[PDB]
Amino acid sequence: HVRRDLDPNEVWEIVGELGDGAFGKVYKAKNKETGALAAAKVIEEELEDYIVEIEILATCDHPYIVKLLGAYYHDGKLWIMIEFCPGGAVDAIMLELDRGLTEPQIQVVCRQMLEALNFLHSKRIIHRDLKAGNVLMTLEGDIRLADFGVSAKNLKTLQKIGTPYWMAPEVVMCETMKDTPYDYKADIWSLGITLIEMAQIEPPHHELNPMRVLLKIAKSDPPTLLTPSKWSVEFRDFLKIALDKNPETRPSAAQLLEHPFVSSITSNKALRELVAEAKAEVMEE
Amino acid sequence: HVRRDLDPNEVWEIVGELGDGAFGKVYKAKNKETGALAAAKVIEEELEDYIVEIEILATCDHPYIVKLLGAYYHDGKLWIMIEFCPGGAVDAIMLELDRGLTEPQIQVVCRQMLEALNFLHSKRIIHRDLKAGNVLMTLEGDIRLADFGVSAKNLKTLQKIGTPYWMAPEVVMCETMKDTPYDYKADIWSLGITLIEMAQIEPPHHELNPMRVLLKIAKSDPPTLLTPSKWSVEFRDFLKIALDKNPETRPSAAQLLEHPFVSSITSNKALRELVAEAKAEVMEE
């Protein structure tokens, strides 16, 4: 999936920057032949993390997951072109609009996220980094799950303890959490938190520093919506079963697709409206 | 610690085989200058596992841990010479004598193992593969903890997920078990099982296949001695607190060194006697 024979800078042009951070710059790229836009990383022996990421991406051909457009290794730089999502990240949308999503909007995101997760889990791919910032929007009002970096760094490890009789109980449990049917449950919890983040702009425990947050997650009862009366019983029930601290009894995405919070969602209209409103808001000067 | 400049086959001669298995052959080597004997691996990009192992070994200079005599990379082969232990592994001793250890013998092994683990844990090294087969004997009746392969493969990983607010409780717990003060607790549990193995020849759940054993460890109450009346209250109490399923409340090696099962053990005589008896038994033809 990494093309060696083709030179990438004859097919793509880097026309802008989308972001920057701890994992380098993300560029906006334009196809000089077709005019298609991509999010791009041009990366100059931790390229094996990116190699595993490309392989996941290439395997993850699905309507609600970001589509890999091309990967190259040329002169050396590793190029990785992925489909541009002009609607942006849902957390940027909430910041731009200065508000959380409506329940109808959350229902669409939830339905589509569940379809994506059901697909990934079928392929034994665990995302492990769900959050509103990794839910990207199209102008049509569909999501795309993004950022398989954590997924890939985790998979590289597993692809790469003790002798069982002598193994401590906590070691048995954490090695048993590395495999089916427990590994994928993590994404279901993170989905629930993401839905709260979308309802309330911030996730639970946002006021605490990251290290205190970890203690809080382990020891606290599962998070609930701050103002329950704003939300349907269906939404609160959905969260109640998704935010199960016990991964054994936490439902799969397939099971959650039959929950009445999402089982009747057959239109993306609420999300298409959201993206239109965000676009119009961005235009204000 | 890996010598490049010196050619190893001018210092050592491979004079025998000690073992074979899934991790290759272990040779017996003799120093052509001094006459000292070593256990040797001569290994022809998973050499980084062995590199981390050498670094651990070089750091683990202690009376009750195997002593690294030399590591080389020459013509390409990786040579790793470690001190020969003529008494052999405690599990081989039990098989040779067709019996378990006496309580006085177990007390000495336990005292010395605790001293070793207290040292390792001070260096933030977790063995992760304690068992009677990794407790080696000298003719003097001292142990040497051996086989840091699992330790090294684990450390290579840590030296080499998610964002905390969205992280599932079970993921928080298993990442929190990867660090102090929880990581080292695993060795305390494995010590307890090892002591049962030494008392009874076989560890608990030896009748079950390895995959069933894992379920059994997670769900069962902690193991106890099969015939309690053979053993002191002190031994049974020691096991009771060491085989704590909760790593939070499981004692450290330092705490266990003050337990009356080991706190008064100031002589290795019982173990020196054991090794003499095993030697004499081996001589029978």
Ligand SMILES: Cc1[nH]c(/C=C2\C(=O)Nc3ccc(S(=O)(=O)N(C)c4cccc(Cl)c4)cc32)c(C)c1C(=O)N1CCN(C)CC1
């Ligand atoms: C408009 C917009 N696009 C993006 C990011 C995109 C995108 O449009 N397409 C896309 C695909 C994948 C990814 S990724 O997270 O998986 N990722 C980092 C990545 C990308 C390429 C290669 C590899 Cl290996 C990995 C990230 C993205 C963002 C964050 C925004 C946005 O909110 N904003 C941007 C515009 N601002 C003015 C407002 C906020």
Ligand SMILES: Cc1[nH]c(/C=C2\C(=O)Nc3ccc(S(=O)(=O)N(C)c4cccc(Cl)c4)cc32)c(C)c1C(=O)N1CCN(C)CC1
């Ligand atoms: C007599 C004897 N010696 C050994 C093994 C030794 C030894 O004598 N010294 C020693 C040091 C280290 C290790 S190790 O487990 O850490 N290991 C595998 C290793 C070694 C070298 C390099 C590296 Cl990286 C790793 C293993 C050993 C064994 C298993 C026996 C034994 O019971 N027996 C052998 C004789 N039989 C007739 C009876 C049973």
Ligand SMILES: [Ca+2]
């Ligand atoms: Ca697509």
Ligand SMILES: [Ca+2]
């Ligand atoms: Ca605004």
Ligand SMILES: [Ca+2]
């Ligand atoms: Ca992002």
Ligand SMILES: [Ca+2]
């Ligand atoms: Ca914030």
Ligand SMILES: [Ca+2]
């Ligand atoms: Ca509803």
Ligand SMILES: [Ca+2]
């Ligand atoms: Ca406006």
Ligand SMILES: [Ca+2]
């Ligand atoms: Ca406005």
Ligand SMILES: [Ca+2]
């Ligand atoms: Ca020594």
Ligand SMILES: [Ca+2]
């Ligand atoms: Ca015999």
Ligand SMILES: [Ca+2]
């Ligand atoms: Ca061995």
Ligand SMILES: [Ca+2]
């Ligand atoms: Ca056995």
Ligand SMILES: [Ca+2]
């Ligand atoms: Ca006693």
Ligand SMILES: [Ca+2]
């Ligand atoms: Ca005899």
Ligand SMILES: [Ca+2]
């Ligand atoms: Ca005999």
